């Protein structure tokens, strides 16, 4: 029905724009008009509810937002069915709210189910599944499930860099997180090798397939020991700089720190 059909869109059209105050009454009225004809159960009621709770998130009315999305998923599951992408998206969303509240163990099953729905709909090695694994890896980081963090970020990388570009920032993000998860574990050389990889991916795109003369930043310093515009790669210079502080390679930690200093 046009009456509702266009209004429903206007809600999205405005909530996205940032005109939340404009959106909320449209939403509210659309709700009362939606329930008159079709009732509580409807995919559009769910969509609209999600929009409302998305306003409540920004407002930091977290428990309300969470409850609202629970109701929305209860509607979404009956209408759209379990193992639906909408259901997955909702489970992902209402887990971020649960995580933010500090209910980390409560968000984990939601996320786990969501990932299982995503895998069913798309595939084992799909990028969204990877985004979900990345999301899931943080829920386990706060929990202190060190090994799981490694597994999930490790699985994420096997879906990122292979499907995506090697120089990609998402890939670097993951390789930076996973290398921190290794630092915690005591897998020091693994994290070191990871950081070297990160540096090399940027260094080659800036210059070209490295030769004796084109040598990378770390190789210069680790050799000096004997005798970068990116933020994600500056963090890397500093992070590897610490590993060389542990490795006793001071000159290396210094040259890395200096290069990082020169970038800011």
């Amino acid at each position: 029905p046009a009456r509702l059909r266009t209004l429903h869109n206007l809600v999205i059209q405005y909530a996205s724009q940032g005109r939340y105050e404009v959106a909320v009454p449209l939403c509210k009225q659309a709700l009362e008009d939606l329930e008159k004809t079709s009732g509580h159960d409807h995919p559009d009621v769910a969509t609209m509810l999600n929009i409302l709770a998305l306003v409540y998130r920004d407002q930091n009315k977290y428990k309300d937002a969470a409850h609202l999305l629970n109701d929305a998923l209860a509607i979404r599951e009956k209408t759209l069915g379990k193992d639906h992408p909408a259901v997955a998206a909702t489970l992902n969303n209402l887990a971020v709210l649960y995580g933010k509240r500090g209910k980390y163990k409560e968000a984990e099953p939601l996320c786990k189910r969501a990932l299982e729905i995503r895998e069913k709909v798309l595939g084992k090695f799909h990028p969204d599944v990877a985004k979900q694994l990345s999301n899931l890896a943080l829920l386990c980081q706060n929990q202190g499930k060190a090994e799981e963090v490694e597994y999930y970020y490790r699985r994420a990388l096997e879906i990122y860099a292979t499907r995506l570009g090697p120089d990609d920032p998402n890939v670097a993000k993951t390789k930076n997180n996973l290398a921190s998860c290794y630092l915690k574990q005591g897998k020091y050389q693994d994290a070191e090798t990871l950081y070297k990889e990160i540096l090399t991916r940027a260094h080659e795109k800036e210059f070209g397939s490295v030769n004796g003369e084109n040598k990378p930043i770390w190789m210069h310093a680790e050799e000096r020991e004997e005798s970068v515009d990116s933020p994600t790669v500056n963090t890397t210079l500093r992070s590897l700089g610490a590993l060389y502080r542990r490795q006793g390679k001071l000159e290396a930690a210094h040259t890395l720190e200096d290069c990082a200093s020169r970038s800011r």
Binding site: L54, A89, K100
Partner: peptide, 10 residues
Amino acid sequence: QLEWDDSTLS
């Protein structure tokens, strides 16, 4: 924190 998934409106 965790990342939000907006495909419900987008």
